[PDB]
Amino acid sequence: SLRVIQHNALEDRSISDKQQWDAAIYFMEEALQARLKDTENAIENMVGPDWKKRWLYWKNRTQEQCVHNETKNELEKMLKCNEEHPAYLASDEITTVRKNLESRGVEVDPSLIKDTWHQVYRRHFLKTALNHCNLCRRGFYYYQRHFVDSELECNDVVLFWRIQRMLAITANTLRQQLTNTEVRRLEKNVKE
Amino acid sequence: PDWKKRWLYWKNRTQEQCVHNETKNELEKMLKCNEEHPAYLASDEITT
Amino acid sequence: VLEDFAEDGEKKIKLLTGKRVQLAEDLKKVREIQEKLDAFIEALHQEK
Amino acid sequence: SLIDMYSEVLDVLSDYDASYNTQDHLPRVVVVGDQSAGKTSVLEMIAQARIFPRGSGEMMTRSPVKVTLSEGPHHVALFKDSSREFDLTKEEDLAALRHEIELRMRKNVKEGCTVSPETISLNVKGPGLQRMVLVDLPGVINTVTSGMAPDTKETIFSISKAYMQNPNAIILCIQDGSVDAERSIVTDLVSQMDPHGRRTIFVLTKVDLAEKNVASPSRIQQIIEGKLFPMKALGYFAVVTGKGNSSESIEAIREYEEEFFQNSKLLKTSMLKAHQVTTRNLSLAVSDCFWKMVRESVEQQADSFKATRFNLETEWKNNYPRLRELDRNELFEKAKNEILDEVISLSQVTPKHWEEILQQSL
Amino acid sequence: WERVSTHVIENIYLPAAQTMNSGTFNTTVDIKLKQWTDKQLPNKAVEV
Amino acid sequence: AWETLQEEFSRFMTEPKGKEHDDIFDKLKEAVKEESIKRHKWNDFAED
């Protein structure tokens, strides 16, 4: 019955309320902020102090964290020059990156280069998602009417709202079925 | 024209000579970073 | 010309190679295959 | 009945596309052999009729051939798109069937190519047959012919891999008396792809020819008992399909095989199991396994195809939110209507503007 | 939601990390959701 | 006159007034226009 109800729970697919749209925006913003904090914690664990935190002491430096900082700076410059880049890394791109690193006397294993590239790619898409959320915070006029020449396509908000309502329906069904059957089963077991 | 000869006018520039000047500057920087280099050019070096 | 094109579906297949045409043809073929399989299942259930 | 409908479904799946996307879902028993390995005689003996034309070295079979074993009112053969019942008894009918098969093979193969992706569907009916579908493929080659397409071997390998992509595809390996078990490319490929061999059953053909070639009886005993093949097959049976020549009738070969089974030089040595004789038990086991695997496959596909259709519909709707299904007929009708509207608009233009434009241009 | 956020992210965004059209992304999301519901989602919900 | 008619027909067939102007229909329209032009006939009585 739970499987059938979960499959059938595909009723609502769009938001027609400004208040519901704002609530979905706030929930998505909270989730993205949590993800950003997790990514920042992972980056700090991988590298350590960064920017003001690193330069506050001005006398504490480590070669391992210096290599990570140089790789991060190189990837940031690459994104500034080329905003759009495929997730995968080709052989020539890896060779060019390694040659650029070794030009100043830095040798980095390809696995660490790939990991840093993946982390930087994730951070860039997190920033892009944050910018998209900022745009969609005012883009409700475009979203509601769906203009032909729309300058903004807000779909993540709708998807997250659909996920939230489906989860709420599933939780309500689970609670109901529990109260119907499992409470009585537990009472019978306790009595026995 | 190169260096003082090129910049004497300060208003005459050509894309063809600009490309050559940029290539010359890049090669000079490469020699400054790496004084010794083989005469032949490998595929990865050309790609870079 | 229109009659010749209509009386020759091979020409339509050769020319109409757009993404929409191919997707619609694939969807129609999948629907027909599923309908045939449903008919097979119904016939098997009725016979047994 | 069920077998005819299953064959029709397989034919529809094959005609769905020239590639292999949904054709690998339902199980398909495919018979793959070696070039000039006598597999033609074994295939003819399976159908109890000479229907495959013989080839003196040349690869006559260049397109996939579907053989559907079933039982009908008469022991005849009928194609999917044909109405003439090719009898499997009269010599003239057999010759006509072979000529039709050759014509179909030539039509599929392009004028200049060697292997054609088009398949040939044939249904075999008659008493004494089982209920299964057999697929015939060209033998695996090693050398490359300079006078043909250099990628013929690659195409054959790709076709074989696509056919083997089916997890429930039963492979019937056919060898020769002069060809050892390790010399069979098909057997080695099956072992490499299926080390366990829980669904592949080895069948030994032309035992008398191998025995007459001063072979070691210990190797034959080990092969029959299964002490040499690493795969754990469900069983091993040794049969004789004649000498492989083109001058022995089906009845004569059957009588010779029966005589050899009744009196064999290896059965009298008490070195072979008594329950590993004949083919009735093996055929029944193969039929039961095929039926259960096809039932499981169709049970899974009853939901798999629905999910695929739903996903395709969702993709079409998402890619074209403001456009519905546009097939060839509707798009052609819309183009015709647009052409008619353009012609109407052209005819409705004021003649004065035409006169002014023509005068100015001239 | 807190339990399956990581699972949803790694099963949706990780494969569809380079999608450009929103329709293709929505179709992939629907396919993944249907597959999860069919395979093990009720069992995971019951366990939770 | 024939050249002017051909130019008008070509302009009508290829009229990218819409912002999309999908080329799938445009190729078919151009093919039909070329076929009609090649199949068109003239009467000498009209010339006289």
The pair of structure tokens assigned to D114 is 């060697």
Instruction: Please give the Cα distance from D185 to D183 (Å, whole number).
Output: 6
The pair of structure tokens assigned to D28 is 């398909």
- In single-letter form, the type of residue at position D67 comes to V
Contact D108, D118 (CB under 8 A): yes
Q: How many CA atoms lie within 13 A of D89 on its CB side?
A: 6
Using a CB–CB cutoff of 8 Å, tell me whether C20 touches chain F: yes
Instruction: Please give the Cα distance from D68 to D77 (Å, whole number).
Output: 9
The pair of structure tokens assigned to D298 is 């169709």
Pairing mode, if any, of strands D86-87 and D76-79?
A: antiparallel
Strand partners, D140: D34
Q: How far is CA D357 from CA A84, D352, F1, F2, F33, in A?
A: 51, 9, 10, 13, 22
D40 annotated ligand binder = yes
Resolution in A: 6.8
- Chains touching A (3+ CB pairs < 8 Å): B, E
* SS3 call for D32: strand
The pair of structure tokens assigned to A106 is 């830095």
Q: Are chains E and F in contact at 3+ CB pairs closer than 8 Å?
A: no
The pair of structure tokens assigned to C16 is 């109409």
Instruction: Please give the Cα distance from C16 to D212 (Å, whole number).
Output: 62
Phi and psi torsions of D2, nearest 5°:
-65, -40
Which of D301, D328, D339 is nearest residue C21 as measured by Cβ atoms?
D328
Q: Which residues of chain D are within 8 Å of residue F29 when distances are taken between CB atoms?
A: 335, 339
The four Cα atoms D251, D257, D263, D264 give a dihedral, to 10 degrees, of 160
Instruction: Please give the Cα distance from D258 to A188 (Å, whole number).
Output: 71
Instruction: Please give the Cα distance from A3 to C2 (Å, whole number).
Output: 53
Q: Which residues of chain F are within 8 Å of residue D359 when distances are taken between CB atoms?
A: none
Contact A158, A144 (CB under 8 A): no
Instruction: Please give the Cα distance from D238 to D221 (Å, whole number).
Output: 10
CB neighbour list of residue D139: distance below 8 Å, 6 or more residues apart:
D32, D33, D34, D35, D36, D37, D39, D59, D61
Q: Are chains C and E in contact at 3+ CB pairs closer than 8 Å?
A: no
What chain E residue is nearest to D303 in terms of C-alpha separation?
E38
Closest by alpha carbon to D66, among D85, D47, D89?
D47
D interface residues, E as partner, C-beta within 8 Å: 303, 307, 310-311, 314-315, 317-319, 321
The pair of structure tokens assigned to D218 is 């210990």
Instruction: Please give the Cα distance from D317 to D189 (Å, whole number).
Output: 44
Instruction: Please give the Cα distance from D298 to C37 (Å, whole number).
Output: 9
Residues of chain E immediately before an interruption (C to N > 2.5 Å):
none
Instruction: Please give the Cα distance from A92 to A98 (Å, whole number).
Output: 10
Q: How far is CA D1 from CA D26, D70, D128, D131, D213, in A?
A: 18, 9, 16, 10, 46
3-state secondary structure D89-112: CCHHHHHHHHHHHHHHHHHHCCEC
Distance of CA D163 to the CA centre of its chain: 9
Closest by alpha carbon to A144, among A14, A23, A26?
A14
Instruction: Please give the Cα distance from B33 to D353 (Å, whole number).
Output: 74
**Torsion-angle region of residue A88: left (phi > 0), alpha (psi -120 to 50) or beta?**
beta
Closest by alpha carbon to D62, among D17, D113, D21?
D113
Instruction: Please give the Cα distance from D65 to D18 (Å, whole number).
Output: 14
Instruction: Please give the Cα distance from D283 to D36 (Å, whole number).
Output: 26
Distance of CA C43 to the CA centre of its chain: 22
D314 CA: distance to closest CA in chain F (Å): 22
D22 annotated ligand binder = no
Triad F1, F7, F10: Cα angle to 5°: 140
Q: Which residues of chain C are within 8 Å of residue D319 when distances are taken between CB atoms?
A: 23
Q: Which residue has the tokens 């097939």?
A: D327
Closest by alpha carbon to A11, among A171, A180, A141, A168?
A168
Instruction: Please give the Cα distance from D5 to D298 (Å, whole number).
Output: 13
Instruction: Please give the Cα distance from C20 to D319 (Å, whole number).
Output: 10
What is the full DSSP assignment across chain A?
-HHHHHHH---------HHHHHHHHHHHHHHHHHHHHHHHHHHHHHT---THHHHTTSS---HHHHHHHHHHHHHHHHHHH-S---SS--HHHHHHHHHHHHHTT----HHHHHHHHHHHHHHHHHHHHHHHHHHHTTTHHHHHHT-TT-S----HHHHHHHHHHHHHHHHHHHHHHIIIIIHHHHHHHHH-
Q: Which residue has the tokens 């798109």?
A: D81
- Chains touching D (3+ CB pairs < 8 Å): C, E, F
Q: Which residue has the tokens 């793959």?
A: D32
Contact A35, A160 (CB under 8 A): no
| Dihedral (CA of B20, B23, B24, B25) sign | positive
Closest by alpha carbon to D237, among D248, D229, D245, D225?
D225
Closest by alpha carbon to E22, among D317, A145, A36, A79?
D317
Using a CB–CB cutoff of 8 Å, tell me whether B33 touches chain A: yes
Instruction: Please give the Cα distance from A82 to A85 (Å, whole number).
Output: 7
Contact A120, A89 (CB under 8 A): no
Contact D43, D136 (CB under 8 A): yes
Q: Note whether F12 contacts D358, CB cutoff 8 Å.
A: no
Contact D346, F8 (CB under 8 A): yes
Triad D226, D231, D236: Cα angle to 5°: 40
Contact D141, D153 (CB under 8 A): yes
**Torsion-angle region of residue D102: left (phi > 0), alpha (psi -120 to 50) or beta?**
alpha
b/e map of A124-163 (b: 16 or more CB within 10 Å)?
bebeebeebbeebeebbebbeeeeeeeeebbbbbbbbbbb
Q: How was this structure determined?
A: cryo-EM
**Torsion-angle region of residue F21: left (phi > 0), alpha (psi -120 to 50) or beta?**
left
Pairing mode, if any, of strands D132-136 and D65-69?
A: antiparallel
Which of D308, D316, D331 is nearest residue C21 as measured by Cβ atoms?
D331
Closest by alpha carbon to D327, among C13, B44, A92?
C13
The pair of structure tokens assigned to D155 is 């195409």
The pair of structure tokens assigned to D350 is 């004021």
Q: Note whether C16 contacts D331, CB cutoff 8 Å.
A: yes
* SS3 call for D304: helix
Closest by alpha carbon to D155, among D15, D18, D11, D25?
D18
Instruction: Please give the Cα distance from C21 to A11 (Å, whole number).
Output: 31
* SS3 call for D27: coil
Contact A43, A119 (CB under 8 A): yes
What is the full DSSP assignment across D189-207?
HHHHH-SS-SS--EEE--H
A2 CA: distance to closest CA in chain E (Å): 7
